[PDB]
RNA sequence: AAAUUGAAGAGUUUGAUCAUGGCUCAGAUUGAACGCUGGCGGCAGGCCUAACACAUGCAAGUCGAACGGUAACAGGAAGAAGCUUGCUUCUUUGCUGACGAGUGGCGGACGGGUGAGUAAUGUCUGGGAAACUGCCUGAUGGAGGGGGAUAACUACUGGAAACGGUAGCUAAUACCGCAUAACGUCGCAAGACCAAAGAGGGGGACCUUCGGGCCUCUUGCCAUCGGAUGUGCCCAGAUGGGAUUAGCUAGUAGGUGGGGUAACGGCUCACCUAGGCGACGAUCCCUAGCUGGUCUGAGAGGAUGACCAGCCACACUGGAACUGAGACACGGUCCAGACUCCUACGGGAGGCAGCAGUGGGGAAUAUUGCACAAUGGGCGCAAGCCUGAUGCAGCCAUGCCGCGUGUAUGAAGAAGGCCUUCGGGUUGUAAAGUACUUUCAGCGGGGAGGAAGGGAGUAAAGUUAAUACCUUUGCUCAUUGACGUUACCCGCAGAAGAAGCACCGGCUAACUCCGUGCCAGCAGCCGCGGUAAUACGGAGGGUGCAAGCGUUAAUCGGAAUUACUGGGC
RNA sequence: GGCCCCUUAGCUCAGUGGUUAGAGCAGGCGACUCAUAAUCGCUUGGUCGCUGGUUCAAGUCCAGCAGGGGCCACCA
């Protein structure tokens, strides 16, 4: 129930970096970003409205690494809440455990954080949680178990993390390896490269 | 009957039927005696037949063979008709 | 409901063969009668064996029949076989599970064509021992032609590598023994003694994966499909899980009951002749010639090459060679399948009585492994035998 | 505070146009089935068809504290061999615990299954009066004295069996009169009439044939009036289709009198009157269990009643009553029928739409499993016994949900496939190579919760003549788990054991080469194929979903295409 | 498990042992057409279900098997 194929193809097809590698190297030296994958790569399409809506939805899904059934459940939840559907959907994707573990610089990629969480190396409030989609609430403390403080992966990720823009809703202590929420991010705290109204128009057909 | 509790119930029910039939027969006998005495036209014979009848229906109701309302019905009808004639 | 079967003596499988109307079923009934009279409880009558309506009408044997008896040293399961030339497949299926046969020859007739055919097939299938019983001695009272019959039987047996000068022969009459004549009943006990002494105790391999060749299928009311046969190797326990591997596609099942002569068991070992009750199997889903095996042990195949000998004259055989495109029948265990032949490059004409390396392809898969013996037959004529060499 | 945030179109009639009007597509859902493929777990669900026919084992018993008793078992006693002088053997004893059969009480009308029949004798909503009600509960009363039987048992005897018969004997909370009777019944009154049963524990003093009397405590017994629960009856409105079904009705509509019922009533009879229903759809024909609810929809509506809960009806087919507080009675009785059996030929036996299981029908649907540890039920003062209800386990990708099948780096942009303007492009950081991790599966070691109670002793307070018995409240002491190798935790080795299906002309996301040549073939709708096919078949590349993916069947939406909201001649 | 029937070209059917196994309807090639139908000129075809026997001679006679149809049993 995971995607286990080549990763640069997805960013090539979306025509935009998806932060899907570590970041030690500029992605110009790794793939030819300007081309779509395959034999008919340089050829260009003329997308319709269905095409652009589908591409936007796929791009968000590949960013966060969620499959279609559970994404549909997320949309239904966000539509059930009281507010704006796009804001709720983006905040709801931003609250799952592996995204938070990546977001405070413990894994180099989202798959790093996925394997860290799945292999019983993370605690929330002094309790082991082994599930990626775990929604984390405000005023929660996320930490690495004492048994897992000696791997080189964690400090390599920590050294890759501080050369990146700091999230304004997490508080991190690298020496103790602790992190704490304050509250959920707002729309202005996330990238403006995403139009969620296309998502809503695709799922509210 | 293929369970060793229905056979006992069948035997007991047959005995109880045989027991109840005779009491019902005697009670009906006395009732129709009073009815015949009324039909004849005499008034004293009807009265003494009714006086002989009344304890029988009272006791038979008390033993569960009939209901109190049945005995009261019989007594009421017979009293009404007996006092009707001259 | 049902009683239980207890194991107290070594168990042996025997049976009867011979020409038609020489007295096989009468002997089969007489043995049980006399033994039960002395000790036991068998008492299995003549019409209790030939029970099917056509058998009762035409007065012959069409199927094979199973009876049981026991001397106070052994426990015998006995198989009675037909004697007609066009029931031979049933006789082969019955004789594939014999530890030793009894050859019935009538003194009035002598050896006959079916006697020789049965002897030859017992050679080619692998029956280890043969006892000779000479029947209808009440008819013939001369003591000179009996020598002629005995001699002729002796060289007939010897010609097919069976030990002729050493095999025992018994005179008697099954009709008189069954009637109750105390004089002739001694010959039955002499036959029983030779049956106890000449046949040794065979070896049973009970440390190998379980395997059972299916030979007959029944539907028991209230219970389901039952398959019978003789356990080749291993052990089967109630509750264990089995594989039906054979000429159809493979199936999975579970064992839910084992019995031996209608007596309840709890597990069947090698050498017994048992019926096994399967769970959730329909009666047209299964058939004679399949294999009931331990899962993931044996496999089916269709194409293979082998080493084989061809019979010659004065042995049945053929009086003419064969070439490519030849399609005879191959007998494996309790099965016969048509197959297409491929001779090695060169050596086209095949002499009647040589060896050869041939490749063969079957029309249905067979549960097969190297070092498996088979026979070759067509049109009422046995022609050879071989050993599975390599499987492709 | 919140209990609401609600409505989208596209293809196809023409040389092109506008309108009208049908067909088809994009969504959600299922007791699904088939094809290809398939790692683990949690929670659910699983004969829709033949209410067809059924082998075998289980699904309803319990009380000795109502009774006479002793077939079995264990204790006690008295005679009794032997020696370790009574160690050990034997026999007679219901004396004790207990208890097969028998009389008696209660339960078997509950619990479990199925949807054949039934368009209203049923169901839903709202009301009413002419009634009964075991076990539970409140109040006021009583609870005296007699009798005749019988089962078991003994003797004889019939029958293949199931099962009987004749003669003796005995007990009771079994059965039947008498006495007493009121707020009970009948009657205007005066009056007349009706019932009952004993057992169990302990004991100071007093008489004991010395069995008991006597005191005390507990539980049962009868009558009457209440409470609560259940059940019977009446009325109004609503609850499919057909007018190519328009007339129907003789106990039929009403009245009087006799009977009947727990109770009102043509409920039933005799007589009198001539009425009663119907276009607001009677009568007849077809189909069908009803509801809370379920799917869809912006709503109004449309389709539907599988699992869970309330009501109804049925129990091989057709009738009938008996017993009881309650039945016209799933594992009861009687009679008739068709099937399947046993028989000594005279006669007998049976009913899976209970839980498993078999054959048959079908496109299609599961184990002849474990336990009464928990909840609930029957009997018992209790201990306890019974429970295919129930609690669990097995099978099945049938559905919903969660997780895994590694992770970072890696240009030689390697080999090999494919395309090529012969320069190169693409698969592609993909692989190999390097450095890390160990969830799940495998092996070893620890380890919650589902358990409340019941038993023994002791202490105090109640009761009383009584520190005895009994009840209530505390404490102490040993125990009660089918699931089960539980959930979960700790350690070990190693990337090691784990990815498929549909599609790529437009609708609709995704393009080229070869083979064939209106042939072979494809298709939901328009439509492709006649020698240069993005549409057929294979290959390379790509798109969408993912332990699933496609196809078929069925419903609503789009459909304002039955139009009340909301259409026309 | 036993017994009894059928199998000739693409389709529907003849052919009773004497040696190229035939008829009709269909089909193939050349001229015309972008391609056909029609018109003109030439025409090719079978595993006689398969394997093995008897006969100088087998589609034909004798057996076994494969595929399909129809009757009858046996019940650890
Ligand atoms: N005089 C005599 N007659 C005998 C003897 N044995 C058999 N028979 C006769 O032969 C007849 C047939 O014998 P049977 O035993 O049936 O022979 P079979 O071998 O079973 C024939 P199939 O091969 O079909 O089974 C019987 O009816 C019997 O009367 C014997 O020893 N003596
Ligand atoms: C029954 O199953 C057994 N006695 C025999 C018949 C098996 C061959
Ligand atoms: Mg999933
Ligand atoms: Mg009196
Ligand atoms: Mg003969
Ligand atoms: Mg003979
Ligand atoms: Mg025979
Ligand atoms: Mg004969
Ligand atoms: Mg002869
Ligand atoms: Mg059109
Ligand atoms: Mg056009
Ligand atoms: Mg159309
Ligand atoms: Mg649809
Ligand atoms: Mg399937
Ligand atoms: Mg069925
Ligand atoms: Mg049904
Ligand atoms: Mg008893
Ligand atoms: Mg049930
Ligand atoms: Mg019920
Ligand atoms: Mg119904
Ligand atoms: Mg139902
Ligand atoms: Mg009504
Ligand atoms: Mg008495
Ligand atoms: Mg007497
Ligand atoms: Mg007496
Ligand atoms: Mg009263
Ligand atoms: Mg009164
Ligand atoms: Mg009064
Ligand atoms: Mg008075
Ligand atoms: Mg008085
Ligand atoms: Mg009195
Ligand atoms: Mg009294
Ligand atoms: Mg009382
Ligand atoms: Mg009372
Ligand atoms: Mg009372
Ligand atoms: Mg009441
Ligand atoms: Mg009430
Ligand atoms: Mg009248
Ligand atoms: Mg009246
Ligand atoms: Mg009246
Ligand atoms: Mg119906
Ligand atoms: Mg309801
Ligand atoms: Mg609408
Ligand atoms: Mg809704
Ligand atoms: Mg419903
Ligand atoms: Mg349904
Ligand atoms: Mg059902
Ligand atoms: Mg019934
Ligand atoms: Mg029936
Ligand atoms: Mg039935
Ligand atoms: Mg009936
Ligand atoms: Mg009654
Ligand atoms: Mg009631
Ligand atoms: Mg009943
Ligand atoms: Mg019931
Ligand atoms: Mg039943
Ligand atoms: Mg069943
Ligand atoms: Mg039934
Ligand atoms: Mg079928
Ligand atoms: Mg089938
Ligand atoms: Mg069970
Ligand atoms: Mg029982
Ligand atoms: Mg059950
Ligand atoms: Mg599952
Ligand atoms: Mg277990
Ligand atoms: Mg497109
Ligand atoms: Mg296609
Ligand atoms: Mg081409
Ligand atoms: Mg072209
Ligand atoms: Mg549809
Ligand atoms: Mg509409
Ligand atoms: Mg529609
Ligand atoms: Mg209108
Ligand atoms: Mg219109
Ligand atoms: Mg031209």
Coordinates of C-alpha atoms (C1' of nucleotides) and ligand atoms in Angstrom, one line a residue, chain D residues 41-43 397 399-400, ligand 64:
Chain D
rG41 C1' -4.5 -7.8 11.4
rG42 C1' -9.2 -5.5 13.9
rC43 C1' -14.7 -5.2 13.5
rA397 C1' -10.6 -10.7 0.1
rG399 C1' -17.7 -5.5 3.1
rC400 C1' -15.4 -1.2 6.1
Ligands
LIG64 MG1 -9.3 -9.9 6.0

